[PDB]
Amino acid sequence: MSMVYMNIMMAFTVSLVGLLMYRSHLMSSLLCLEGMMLSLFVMAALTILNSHFTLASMMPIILLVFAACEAALGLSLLVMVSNTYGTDYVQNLNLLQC
Amino acid sequence: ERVAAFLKNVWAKEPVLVASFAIAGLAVILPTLSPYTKYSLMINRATPYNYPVPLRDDGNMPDVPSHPQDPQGPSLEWLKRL
Amino acid sequence: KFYIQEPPHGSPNWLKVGLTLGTSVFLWIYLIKQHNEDVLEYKRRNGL
Amino acid sequence: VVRDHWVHVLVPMGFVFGYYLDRKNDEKLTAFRNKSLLYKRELKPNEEVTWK
Amino acid sequence: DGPEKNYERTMAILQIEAEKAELRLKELEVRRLMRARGDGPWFHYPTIDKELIDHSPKATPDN
Amino acid sequence: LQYGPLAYILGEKATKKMTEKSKLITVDGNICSGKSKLAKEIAEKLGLKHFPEAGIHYVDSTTGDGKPLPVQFSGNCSLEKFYDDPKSNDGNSYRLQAWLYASRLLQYADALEHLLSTGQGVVLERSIYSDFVFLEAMYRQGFIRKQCVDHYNQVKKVTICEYLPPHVVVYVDVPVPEVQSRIQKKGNPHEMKITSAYLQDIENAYKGTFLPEMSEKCEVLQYSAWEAQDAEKVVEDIEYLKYDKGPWLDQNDRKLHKLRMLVQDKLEVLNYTSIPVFLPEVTVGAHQSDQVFQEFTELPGRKYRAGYNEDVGDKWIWLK
Amino acid sequence: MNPIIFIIILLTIMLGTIIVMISSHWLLVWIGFEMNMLAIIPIMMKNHNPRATEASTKYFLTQSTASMLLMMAVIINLMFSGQWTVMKLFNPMASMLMTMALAMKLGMAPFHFWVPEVTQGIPLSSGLILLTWQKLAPMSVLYQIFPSINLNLILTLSVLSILIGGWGGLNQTQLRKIMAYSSIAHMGWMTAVLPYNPTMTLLNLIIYIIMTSTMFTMFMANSTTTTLSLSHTWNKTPIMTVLILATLLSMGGLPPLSGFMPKWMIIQEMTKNNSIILPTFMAITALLNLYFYMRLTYSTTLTMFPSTNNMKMKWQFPLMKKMTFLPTMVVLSTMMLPLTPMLSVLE
Numbered sequence A: 001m002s003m004v005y006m007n008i009m010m011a012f013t014v015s016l017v018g019l020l021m022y023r024s025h026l027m028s029s030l031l032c033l034e035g036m037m038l039s040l041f042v043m044a045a046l047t048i049l050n051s052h053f054t055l056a057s058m059m060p061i062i063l064l065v066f067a068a069c070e071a072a073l074g075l076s077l078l079v080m081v082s083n084t085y086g087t088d089y090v091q092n093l094n095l096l097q098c
Numbered sequence B: 001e002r003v004a005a006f007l008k009n010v011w012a013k014e015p016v017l018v019a020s021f022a023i024a025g026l027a028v029i030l031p032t033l034s035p036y037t038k039y040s041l042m043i044n045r046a047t048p049y050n051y052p053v054p055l056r057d058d059g060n061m062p063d064v065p066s067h068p069q070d071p072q073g074p075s076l077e078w079l080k081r082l
Numbered sequence C: 001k002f003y004i005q006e007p008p009h010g011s012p013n014w015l016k017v018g019l020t021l022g023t024s025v026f027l028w029i030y031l032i033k034q035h036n037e038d039v040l041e042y043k044r045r046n047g048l
Numbered sequence D: 001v002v003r004d005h006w007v008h009v010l011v012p013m014g015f016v017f018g019y020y021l022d023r024k025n026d027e028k029l030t031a032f033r034n035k036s037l038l039y040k041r042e043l044k045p046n047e048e049v050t051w052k
Numbered sequence E: 001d002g003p004e005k006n007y008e009r010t011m012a013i014l015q016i017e018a019e020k021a022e023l024r025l026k027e028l029e030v031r032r033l034m035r036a037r038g039d040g041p042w043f044h045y046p047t048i049d050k051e052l053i054d055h056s057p058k059a060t061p062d063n
Numbered sequence F: 001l002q003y004g005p006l007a008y009i010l011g012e013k014a015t016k017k018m019t020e021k022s023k024l025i026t027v028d029g030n031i032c033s034g035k036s037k038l039a040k041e042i043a044e045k046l047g048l049k050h051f052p053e054a055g056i057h058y059v060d061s062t063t064g065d066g067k068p069l070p071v072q073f074s075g076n077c078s079l080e081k082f083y084d085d086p087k088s089n090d091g092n093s094y095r096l097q098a099w100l101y102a103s104r105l106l107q108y109a110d111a112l113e114h115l116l117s118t119g120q121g122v123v124l125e126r127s128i129y130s131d132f133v134f135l136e137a138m139y140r141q142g143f144i145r146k147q148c149v150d151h152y153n154q155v156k157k158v159t160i161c162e163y164l165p166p167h168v169v170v171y172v173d174v175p176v177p178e179v180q181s182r183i184q185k186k187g188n189p190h191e192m193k194i195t196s197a198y199l200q201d202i203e204n205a206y207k208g209t210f211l212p213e214m215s216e217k218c219e220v221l222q223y224s225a226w227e228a229q230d231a232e233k234v235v236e237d238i239e240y241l242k243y244d245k246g247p248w249l250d251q252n253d254r255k256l257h258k259l260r261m262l263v264q265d266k267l268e269v270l271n272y273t274s275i276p277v278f279l280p281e282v283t284v285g286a287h288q289s290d291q292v293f294q295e296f297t298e299l300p301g302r303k304y305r306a307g308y309n310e311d312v313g314d315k316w317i318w319l320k
Numbered sequence G: 001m002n003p004i005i006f007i008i009i010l011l012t013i014m015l016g017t018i019i020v021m022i023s024s025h026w027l028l029v030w031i032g033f034e035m036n037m038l039a040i041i042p043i044m045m046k047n048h049n050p051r052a053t054e055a056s057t058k059y060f061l062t063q064s065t066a067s068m069l070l071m072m073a074v075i076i077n078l079m080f081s082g083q084w085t086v087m088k089l090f091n092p093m094a095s096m097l098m099t100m101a102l103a104m105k106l107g108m109a110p111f112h113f114w115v116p117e118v119t120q121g122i123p124l125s126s127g128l129i130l131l132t133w134q135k136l137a138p139m140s141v142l143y144q145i146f147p148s149i150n151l152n153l154i155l156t157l158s159v160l161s162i163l164i165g166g167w168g169g170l171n172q173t174q175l176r177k178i179m180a181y182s183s184i185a186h187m188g189w190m191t192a193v194l195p196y197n198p199t200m201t202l203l204n205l206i207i208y209i210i211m212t213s214t215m216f217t218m219f220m221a222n223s224t225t226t227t228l229s230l231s232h233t234w235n236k237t238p239i240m241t242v243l244i245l246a247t248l249l250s251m252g253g254l255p256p257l258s259g260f261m262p263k264w265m266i267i268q269e270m271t272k273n274n275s276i277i278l279p280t281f282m283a284i285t286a287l288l289n290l291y292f293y294m295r296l297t298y299s300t301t302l303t304m305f306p307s308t309n310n311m312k313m314k315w316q317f318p319l320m321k322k323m324t325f326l327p328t329m330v331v332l333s334t335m336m337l338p339l340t341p342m343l344s345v346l347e
């Protein structure tokens, strides 16, 4: 494939690894989720734009809309996690082992 | 009577929301009552973004013109008068 | 014995009883006429 | 019919009903009635089927 | 039951079970062929419907 | 419609039935402190429903024909046995206290259901909020083990959290020496065996823990023995309360609907009163449980759901 | 939650699932999953406690991750075919990513860790939706993409799910965690037969849903969530202990109950394709599921556990729970084996 795809696919993989390798802050992982969607938007936009798939030009826009619904949903849960424990640390969410 | 009693109250307390709903209602309603709405679609149709590919004259298309200045084909006289 | 609080089902709910019996009757008639319709259509299509 | 002796028809009826159903099964398995090489014959003047 | 009835009832039973047995074997071989060759009503995985294509003259000629 | 989400959607919202007179009032005090009389008079004057203090046979009064059931259908817990032998080996002391709390929890749910569904306030004599004083008195006198207290707290912490405290807490402060004389006049031979130290422990819990807690969230009125002798003066105080604190200010139709769905479902109310915690005082073997349960279903009008018992004259069973 | 808001949110959970099942376009399939995930989270948080918050968070992180892998597969598929039709995929890398994406959505092993925890952290009514309705959409996608799925991958997931589900349930006393590991074990049977006969995947899915709905409804009827709390049922409602016994023996796959039907039809399809070792391994490993079903029947129906004195108060009140469809569901869960040939309706 064209060389641009090497870096966009690489960017998606970097964010996927960033998502799967947690640290403490839950906000940091939510950012990696937003980054994953950004690479998908760009990767989809390139294909659609380059192939002149006219009606598919709206598809990346629709992608962003449900990205915001996910980010808003993620932030809502972060608020509740923060209220319970006073931090957004993911090590506090370990009550359900038992 | 309650039609005016409720309306007067909201005019006094939240005229901003009264104006908002009145304007939104007109947007929904007037397009279906206006006699000029039908020309909006005709003007959009008459705009030639694309080339008008000619048809192979096969010997029996009386309604189709041979030249752009022939009497056949749609006309825009209505558009000059709008 | 004679209840201190009147039971919720102390008396029949006649509106439900009518609906329940009316539905059973209706469904039964619908089923039978369908079966008769299918039997006649089946004989018609197979030259019987 | 008594108030003490109506439950005593259930099993006897079940046997009679099962007996009846058993014979109806034989009505579905007459493809070879009077057609086997071993027992195929001619019907008697009044007979309609060798077995029913 | 007399021996004749049971004898010929058995032949009726064997005919049905033999016919069913042959169909069971035939269905396994038909399924094997249909799946391998894709030339029958079974294992007919959908392809894109061609009535979706627009054949009208396009904005440009070479397409 | 039986109450539920559908009834709520159609307009059955508590804010429509509640008024300034829809109040939950609890009269509390020591034994033989005049609670019953004062509670009954407050209820009659204000137009509220009076609930006599929940006893062993409270649940019987709300089901069946309303009569008390034989004592085996309450575990054989006995108040008289508690007074005679408060250290009974058979665990009667705590078994009674656990039973009484559950009876009060049920009475509180019934009271709340009445308040929410009709808007008429109610008057209670003690409640789940004040029942613990008797548990503290029992423990300080050695009548129950510490394990029983731990069990009691577990049951309370998962049940009391679900309800709203009473609007008004009326308290009659009668000092112990006067209480002992009152018991001596009352004449119940078992009740005369109460030690004063036990009575003082009831008072120490009331003054030490109950009232300081209720003050934060309820209107609390304390009346000496004589002040309580005129309910008309008590009613006058209740009628002019501010009602400026507590969780009732924070309630809305959405919350009172959820609360009403709980209290009308009595098995849901009583869910955690039988947590599988095996104390000897409240654990029952399978053979005993099976036998008593079978006997219970052989009682008049108890074999089937209410309204389906033909042994007591229910009709149209085949259409119900 | 306002009752009207609860109904609107529930209908949105169903709308997202429906969109997935009726869409011919990969973008609308992805939208359906996203809409479904958005609506279910408030059902998880309905009781607002730290365990519900933890459960919803773990659920959101897992499902959101799966959707990104799902959309990655769709875009890779677009590059290598230039279309969006929901059908076989045209790139093996896309097939793997989509297959993993659906495995995480279903909670198949080794992507299973969230299922026991999320199920434990949410109420019983929400757990019922999670372990039943939420399986429909991912399975409906696997049903359409299986001709391009890697056989080794899908059978590996099925094998691991049956093992981990069976082993995981042996150590559980919490009912919601028992149902969760049971669901993992049953997911494996559905996907194991998918490469050979998708019709048998639907049958297992439908029968699993009926039996799982029956159990959850009976747990809700008595507000029981632990083994010991459920062991008091013989003293409240004896009939419910017999229904639990019949249903649990059915989930174990014992003839002549209905739950034997899917295990039986799956073994038939696998043997027709000369797969002998795998169905044998699967059937024996399902004995682990029967073991911890049998423990529940022992503590619930076939013995009488100690009771408490306060239990006597409950004798005087009737069951008020709706228990919608429970009479029908329990009969279907148990007495359906004679009608096995009706599986052709799913063909």
Ligand SMILES: CCCCCCCCCCCCCCCCCC(=O)OC[C@H](COP(=O)(O)OCCN)OC(=O)CCCCCCCCCCCCCCCCC
Pocket (backbone or CB within 6 Å): G237, G238, G239, G240, G241, G242, G243, G245, G246, G249, G256, G257, G301, G302, G330, G331, G334, G335, G336, G337, G338
């Ligand atoms: C049809 C062809 C296909 C074949 C598949 C198999 C079909 C059977 C499917 C069964 C479906 C479940 C429904 C079973 C109905 C059981 C009825 C029953 O148990 O009696 C009710 C009674 C409940 O008690 P109660 O309502 O209070 O009555 C007064 C007594 N207290 O019960 C009790 O009081 C009993 C309490 C003690 C518990 C004893 C438990 C051992 C007996 C269990 C027998 C049922 C086993 C079912 C499992 C499948 C059997 C093949």
Ligand SMILES: CCCCCCCCCCCCO[C@@H]1O[C@H](CO)[C@@H](O[C@H]2O[C@H](CO)[C@@H](O)[C@H](O)[C@H]2O)[C@H](O)[C@H]1O
Pocket (backbone or CB within 6 Å): A009, A013, A016, G076, G091, G092, G093, G097
């Ligand atoms: C969770 C993982 C996160 C990382 C995700 C990274 C996604 C990257 C997607 C790249 C997709 C490339 O897909 C891969 O392209 C090459 C093209 O040479 C194909 O190559 C193969 O097929 C084509 C023709 O079919 C020919 O080149 C040849 O037969 C063979 O080399 C592979 O069959 C295909 O699988």
Ligand SMILES: Nc1nc2c(ncn2[C@@H]2O[C@H](COP(=O)(O)OP(=O)(O)OP(=O)(O)O)[C@@H](O)[C@H]2O)c(=O)[nH]1
Pocket (backbone or CB within 6 Å): F029, F030, F031, F032, F033, F034, F035, F036, F037, F053, F079, F082, F096, F097, F100, F131, F134, F135, F186, F191
């Ligand atoms: N052990 C125990 N006894 C209780 C409990 N509640 C009530 N009692 C007893 O029930 C009996 C009646 O309670 P009281 O109302 O306080 O006594 P009274 O004679 O009626 O005096 P009044 O306040 O006027 O009603 C008393 O013997 C109490 O000790 C309880 O929770 N635990």
Ligand SMILES: [Mg+2]
Pocket (backbone or CB within 6 Å): F035, F036, F053
């Ligand atoms: Mg009294």
